[model samples]
Target: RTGWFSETWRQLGTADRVPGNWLLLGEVPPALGSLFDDPLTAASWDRSTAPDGVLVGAGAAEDLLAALHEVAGHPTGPVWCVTSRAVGVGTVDDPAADVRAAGVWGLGRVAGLELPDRWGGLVDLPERIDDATRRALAGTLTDGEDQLAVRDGQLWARRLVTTPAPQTGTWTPKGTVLITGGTGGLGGHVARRVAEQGSADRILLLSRQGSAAPGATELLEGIRAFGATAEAVAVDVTDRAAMSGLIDALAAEGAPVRTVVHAAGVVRDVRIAETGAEELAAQMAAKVEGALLLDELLPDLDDFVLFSSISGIWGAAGQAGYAAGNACLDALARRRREQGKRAVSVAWGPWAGGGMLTEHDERELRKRGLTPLLVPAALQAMEQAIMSDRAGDPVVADVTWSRFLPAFTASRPSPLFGSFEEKAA
Candidate 1:
């Protein structure tokens, strides 16, 4: 009994060596207190001198990070992550809360990935927690066994195996493949990929400027080089009536858009507090509104895609509004899935030397631990997702978690690192 106890604590190495119960807890649920209060207090509590186990409130940014840093610095046992509103566990409508919840889940997941040996599972609980629940949660952490605690009791971790989606090497495009933001950075790149895939009837590139788009003609030329004919149409996807009319006209003209990609959005990074409803709506119109409009207009499309952002999947500190806007796309994709229509959202991480990110911004991101997804990799990922059978909902950009985890967790405690998969060779 003495050896058993001593070795365990000897590993966890004590948040404090007080011959009594010492718990290093961090970030409480909204019910416990304000998130803004004493966030760094956990570091002080997590003394290297000693502790039995570590308790993490899923949004537990400090505790979780420190715990990992601690254990990796030496040895440890029993790491528990207290999470709430687990994605797909239940419905939570608030965008910020949902994003925050995602962050928490990611923290636990990364902890599990980083240190599976000492990793416990995520605990999804409500306010009315009980002694039984506490005991159960504690037990899960101690043995470093991964599990989740919902109202339905304890749910253990399961290995989610993504069966290579039974892939095919080639694909045939239907009547018309429409790409919104066609002339833009990401859109143009995707357009080229789409063209190379199959020589469809026509590739319609939709943008607000139509042929007037700076490189609209050049874009069409590039598509044509791949033996695909493309026409850039000046259209605002957010204009529901206009979009509907365009869809109707296209259908009537026997040029029905069989594949569609909603890739029209901007970099309006206003914090949630400063963002006005109008600003949010304006931002949403390009993405959130555009998705619904497209979904409604082209109900029977072969391929419906959305170009979302990593910030949307993982709660970016300054990009709250942008994240929310992209969040709408993810939700819309889920809805489409329910409706038996496959709508896939590609929540892309920052692109290397492309998209809205500047060179300085790219360097800054790297310094902060966010390795950008390169152009070649980005195209490859989308192409794979485009052709996959199980391609629905949000597919986030795949990045090295080792670099991303620390910078991300430290930045306002977001754990929504998403289930970003590798682009297999």
Candidate 2:
């Protein structure tokens, strides 16, 4: 663990400001709520709130409409969210369990946006914070750094670091190139590109409607014209039974499954409280459960790639559950890698064209200071993800963080925004 995955933790507990009032958010587990709300303890939140910080619990996607109205009547200023245990921390043996453990915590990140920002901190804390090490943990957030964490009783601060561009082996298509939500925007694009290479023997586009999907016929013909066998199959991605049937047929045909580009997902815009349990059930089924089942069934894949979102990594207000769902994809991707498989999660920004974001959605998104990702650049990035030997490390592109951050922070500051401080304008 020294060279390969050695962690460097930094402690920051200089009483540079007042210890603001600490509130317990959600439920801090069992009897722990009492431990955080107190006079002596109230003075320990290391938040710029310098305002106050609250002890935490956790986000939901179940209710689509709940997220938006959830924040309307809530009172707040600079909200800090504290979450329980990291996904893979205590359970190295059970990754599926770890993913479930992390579900709500991921939602907590986006849900917190309803409260407020411009001060304080937001962190996913390790479970069990006692008075002995609590104050030390509390002071880490407010020390001007945007991200903070405590693991093994050591404070860890995460900062933006440059990653070396990958120049490594590229994986090629073997038997079949399957893209879930394949008839959709990015899915179609990826499929067309893969087929045009004339490398993959069979290109299957699976979606809810399959061949009946709008543009499915044209897309299939377009790829077919490229001299590649392309066909669309209507398959329910969340249905393991459906996928199993496909596997059975593939086995019968002697052409085994090879690569998977999981691009299946949906979005329900709203605040946390505004949403209800299971609000985004379809979304969860498509992205989270879909990825899990795919990973579980196809344990050995050449390249298992997931199309995630920036909202998951960065947290979006109206997307509490949506963000949580995307976050699950990231965690699952990492979990797959631990099992010695090649998995990559591409956390993407809005694209210059296609998929779910329609014309109506553009104004709101642009006003938020996010530029759509160029189609050519996006395709190149996708190609690199498939070829380069970059597993576990994700690709996020076409974003000017400096421009995005100020607008994102005008109302509230985020741990994601906090980590990226480059003059990205």
Candidate 3:
């Protein structure tokens, strides 16, 4: 969100400018197609012969998802996607940015994971499409650069790197630390961490089930055991009027709210084909509606920590709705920081012991080269994120890239891993 999380930065690099015998997947103007040396449209092309690579043109999230499904199980070469100002890159002004297509970037990342061999990568074109832009697209397609953007003739490639540990002393906000979905697995862990550290004096937990949530009693008792006071109140985070009343009530009491940890969200797994609008809305209600309400209700705060997911950051098959919701959270965090607010959206991978993920999900993730995050390590990473003075939304995951790339790139090589490959090796 804020400059693509601190773990990755946009590296200005050179493009080979080589034109390829590319295959077009979606609508393409003749003017744009002429830039390529030789290109074949999907319908007219021969399925028996694999072209140099496949190019999917820009479209809405659903259209992109449909395109992904159409290409699924096909023995195609690298699959490159083209988007129009769909993502953010630093402080640049994206006047015509299309937030609707944001999910495609996340979905594209998952494409690379699920369809690794055939996945080329995604490139976001500028608002103004011209001759130069078309040439830039041609060059980028054959340049072997995954996750890139071409703007004003400059090439910006996404690169992930490790960050330093926090150097500052222990930090916590005064007054109550309000945690949405506080009784849940991740939220409970966060409450425990702050309470055990003796950093937070009072913690307020909010959820649909409130004190009636499965582990609500234990979580509150666990906080009390550490000598930190806490209370759980049932509240639907998405209800604006109710949330505002709750905040007002907290202010009237001796303990006023000073921080918010928005960990409330739901995951609905529906494949692109069967995923209807209702299904997507159901998946987004808690995360999107609740977060917007929090952002509006709590103007000033010591911390606005958003609990995001790696699925949103890198796309997860059958989790398009979830990914899109998380992407919005990341965008909100970036926007808040731009206005000089304290916000950090941590996009996390699945936790080992307790999390929203099911046993079957964990097994599937493991097969794809992702190991569940240990609780201690994850909390430590959380601390680092909250304590950081940086502006990027970090993607925290326990992935052995060395072991991951082989499976992730089984079909073909990925420029996405070019930089990390050395470190992983």
Candidate 3 lDDT tens digits, 1-425 = 11113335465753324455667777656655666666777577776776777778765455566666666666667878888756776645443435456656766775665665567888887766776677777676655567887777677776655555554455666678999989988999988888888777689889999999997888798798876689998999999888999899988886678889999998876765566657766787788778888988988888999998877775666787788778777777877776788888889877877768889878988887788888888888787788876666888887776676777667656565565676564
Compared with the true structure, all predictions reach lDDT values of 0.59, 0.63, 0.74
Clash total of candidate 1: 11
State every prediction's TM-score relative to the real structure.
Answer: 0.62, 0.78, 0.77
Candidate 2, 1-425: lDDT as tens digits:
00011112244442222254554444455434444435222234333333244444453333213322332343433444454443443222222334543455456556545555432454545555555335444555344544456555555554332344454444467787789999999899889878767788888898989999999988888899866577889898889899989977976898767899999888887656656665656557798988988898887678888998877766777786677777778777777777788888777778767898888786667667666777766777666666665454454555555566787776665444343675532
Estimate the Cα RMSD of every predicted model relative to the unseen true structure.
11.6, 6.6, 5.2
Model 1 stretches astray by more than 4 angstroms:
1-86, 90-167, 391-398, 411-425
270: Cα error in model 1, Å: 1.6
When 2 and 3 are scored with lDDT, the better candidate is 3
Clashing pairs in 3: 5-393, 79-120, 117-411, 117-412
Considering every candidate listed, which one attains the maximal lDDT? 3
Q: How many angstroms is residue 90 displaced in model 1 relative to the true structure, after the best TM-score fit?
A: 9.3
Deviation from truth (RMSD, Å), model 2: 6.6
